[PDB]
Amino acid sequence: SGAIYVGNYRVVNRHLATHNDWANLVWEDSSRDLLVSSTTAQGCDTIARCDCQTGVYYCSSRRKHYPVSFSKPSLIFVEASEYYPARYQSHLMLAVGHSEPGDCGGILRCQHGVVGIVSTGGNGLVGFADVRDLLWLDEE
């Protein structure tokens, strides 16, 4: 679990969205595993606007932050997970590192702020849902 809190937006894994997130829906995309909902209190997070391929992500299943190199956001085939089938996911960035299903929502951050959240795992890779293309998170 985990979320990005930017302005009055809450960014979560679409597969972990609550009834409240769906009841207060701003934007969702099953092919990115991303859902954004509206918040009452404003958020502490800034969004990276950058093409950085180095950063640090939180791994809840290790209680650790790991510096990683990661691929640019792409359309990637992902093997079946306990929360999704074997399928293509878009705007996905891969690095070498530990990602279990409960790691989804852990933040990946660079020198420019929040890059994305853990979305995929297994075979010693960790996939992140990029949010740096979502410029609209930075206003309204």
How far apart CA 122 and CA 67 sit, in angstroms, is 18
Q: Which of 22, 50, 136, 138 lies at the binding interface for ligand TQC (CB under 6 A)? A: 136
Residue 128 is classified by DSSP as E
Q: Which of 19, 23, 40, 140 lies at the binding interface for ligand TQC (CB under 6 A)? A: 140
Least distance to ligand TQC from the beta carbon of 136, Å?
3
The binder of 66, among ligand TQC, Zn ion, none, by C-beta within 5 to 8 A per type, is none
Dihedral angle computed from the Cα positions of residues 108, 78, 1 and 133, in that order, rounded to the nearest 10 degrees? 40
Least distance to Zn ion from the beta carbon of 96, Å?
19
- Give the active site residue among 15, 29, 65, 98: 15
Closest CA to 4 of 138, 122, 97, 140: 138
User: What are the residue numbers of the active site?
Assistant: 15, 33, 104
